[PDB]
Symmetry: C3
């Protein structure tokens, strides 16, 4: 909600209470997982052609006792400039380049974005240390095309899963539509940090990933799907997976009254693992729906139908989960 | 302060800096205990008869070095709907059912709400995992009556004091007044979680509590009092108290100029403790006052006169405390 | 940004995303150190002569993984009253008295305020437990003079570096100007806490500090400088420094277009250290500049030229650092 629009500055305070319960056995555990979001975002307008902005998004736990003050964590912190027509540059906590792809099917009521996309995993989902250029429609009219170059500074304070060396990411998108249609691909080659190569699995030199996505979003239908492959990036109980192939798909329909059913499927498949062969990393069908009471209030049910087996060589968790909830947001 | 009231949505950003000092010896320790509160709350109006809301309240420490980033904790997170006349349903971090009672005398400048009401202690004070129905005036005119049914999902991540199994809570309230008068009672039976019954004290099967309160709030006087009993819920240095009886009372007068004296007394009495017999759990007189400069600014002094003895079988703390402070709030 | 100015109350929500990168070796480390600030501040007006306020400022990390929820910390929490002409009293997390001095040259793009001023170091920089009276222009016209008396309650929960006993602080400032001119001095004598005197270095009885500053801020030039001395307050790897002498200087020029170069130098010199003699504690030249796009958006480069030696008896860090960034703020 735009709480300030004065003298060339627009403050926008946003947020969401997601009261939310998981009923299930202990895969991604069960019981309450409600949370609150909070964020501002400014846009100061320097000149009629230039603009600057900062965005901040934190996330505060809903489910802990108040004695567990290990409760908030930030999601987005950046601030940058955008010139009329030349595009936008920014730095700070942001979204890697491959997620320009993987977002196409990250629309479930709750589950999903679960495959190749780990958070604080080099440029795959959210990420620290990112300079980002994004050009749009291409300088002089390839209208529709959209471009991103990004650099990520090394991050080796953190846990060994969470670390990375200096790297790079592109992606592009061309849109069209009598109604609406788009295709997308991205590229990452971030080298791996030294301390990480003292590990059991996926040891090596560089860490790449690439993806491709097709979407269709028109006259209330939404469909999207993408493939992705990673070489030594995805974290594995042994150590980072040598390779993986991941596939996501999504079909959703929004009724006029408010109901919005979603179907989607998530597969992540471990490959050439350094002592276990190939076990799958993620395999479930998602069935669910939210009901949009309006822009602000909503309620949902989601059902992860884990499709993974019991004899699972990486001793993962074959347990279904059913999330139910209402989401107020302003 | 209602910072947004547009297109059927009212954002209300609130908060309070309580700069506050305890002078005392080390019972609930001494020195600074100032804190800050911050919360929004929305109310989107779907239709002329329905409404939805979310409330969030965190609490950020005032007193630590900045090197002790163990500093914030959330108090309320929920979001729900309310239909004209049928009442309100919500889920998330909220207030148990017995606190519909114990609030009657939780009005001191600082101390109190200290008896049967522990925070993250099954539905006794604040609490995680709560679905809550509250009906008011009873559907068709018992005007004055007010009703609450609540369910609390199991919470066993947390510390053993802090855990609980699935449970239930009712309370009701009928109001009246030529000026103002009300009576209240509530009920809880949450079963105890398995890991908790590996304890020394108050082991068992179910954990109940019940309370009763009378209040009088009219032409500037305010008086209220309540009894409460718990079976294996209140945390004890040995382990949860087998039973307890707790009594609170409060007399307060608000002058026209701004001064508001308060008298109150708090007694919590351990019963059938599993190795110590019965020691009291809380016994103090509270004398104090706030001066309301206005809606926003205020200042106070409170004085807990601990009435507990020295030879205290549960080795509690007989030490007085005197809190002084000013409270800005918006 | 003043988001509320109604019925005698002005809420002011502020904040800043400082996306920011250090390139360097590991002195104050290297890579991302962007952060976000957030604060409100109220001012309720009781009567035409009196006013009350609260200020709160937290600071949330930009650079950690979201798995390291050790991320926010508060900077300012207080709330007080100010009477027309008699001055202002407040309590809570605030700025000691010596910092009324040391602020004169704490203006770099990033570095500086680094000498005698440690945060949560008795009244030297930010600080917990502070009652503060500040009188201004002196009751009856010494216009220009400005006065501060402050008391700091003991703080012994915290780490031994971070602790302190009860203490006191004055400072005064007289301003003038055909353009602008001022001189300042402050005094602290906080006794040291008992647990702290079980240390190797700077053991003793009382902890004093004093400072002096001259500034010149006119027709776009800004120059300022100050001396400071501490007896057993500044933390040393062995233990608190017995004495120190610290000197800061700053020359800055603001062009009409927006560029604002800064020169400054920081020296902190350990004296009579209890096993090491005298090594310097801080010695660097700072060269840098911010470009102010406007009130809100800006970008900078700073360069700490560490001037400290390698054979450094307190095994400190002779490594340069170069900070680059943009700052959005509202």
């Amino acid at each position: 909600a735009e709480i300030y629009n004065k003298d060339g500055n627009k403050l926008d305070v946003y947020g969401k209470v997601k009261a939310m319960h998981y009923m299930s056995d202990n895969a991604s555990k069960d019981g309450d997982q409600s949370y609150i979001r909070f964020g501002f975002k400014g846009e100061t307008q320097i000149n009629d052609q230039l603009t600057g902005y900062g965005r901040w998004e934190a996330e505060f736990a809903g489910n802990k006792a108040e004695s567990d003050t290990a409760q908030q964590k930030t999601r987005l912190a950046f601030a940058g400039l955008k010139y009329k027509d030349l595009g936008s540059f920014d730095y700070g906590r942001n979204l890697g380049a491959l997620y320009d792809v993987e977002a196409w099917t990250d629309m479930f009521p709750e589950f999903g974005g679960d495959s190749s996309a780990q958070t604080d995993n080099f440029m795959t989902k959210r990420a620290s240390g990112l300079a980002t250029y994004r050009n749009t429609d291409f300088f002089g009219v390839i209208d529709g095309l959209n471009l991103t170059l990004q650099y990520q500074g090394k991050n080796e304070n953190r846990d060994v899963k969470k670390q990375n060396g200096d790297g790079f990411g592109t992606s592009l998108t061309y849109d069209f539509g009598g109604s609406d249609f788009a295709i997308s691909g991205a590229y990452t080659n971030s080298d791996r940090t030294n301390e990480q190569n003292l590990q059991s699995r996926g040891t090596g030199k560089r860490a790449e990933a690439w993806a491709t996505g097709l979407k269709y979003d028109a006259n209330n239908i939404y469909l999207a799907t993408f493939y992705s492959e990673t070489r030594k990036m995805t974290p594995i109980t042994g150590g980072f997976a040598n390779k993986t192939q991941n596939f996501e798909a999504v079909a959703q329909y929004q009724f006029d009254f408010g109901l919005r059913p979603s179907l989607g499927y998530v597969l992540s498949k471990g490959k050439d693992i350094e002592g276990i062969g190939d076990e799958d990393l993620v395999n479930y069908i998602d069935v669910g729906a939210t009901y949009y009471f309006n822009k602000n209030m909503s309620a949902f049910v989601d059902y992860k139908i884990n499709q993974l087996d019991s004899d699972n060589k990486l001793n993962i968790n074959n347990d279904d989960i059913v999330a139910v909830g209402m989401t107020y947001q302003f």
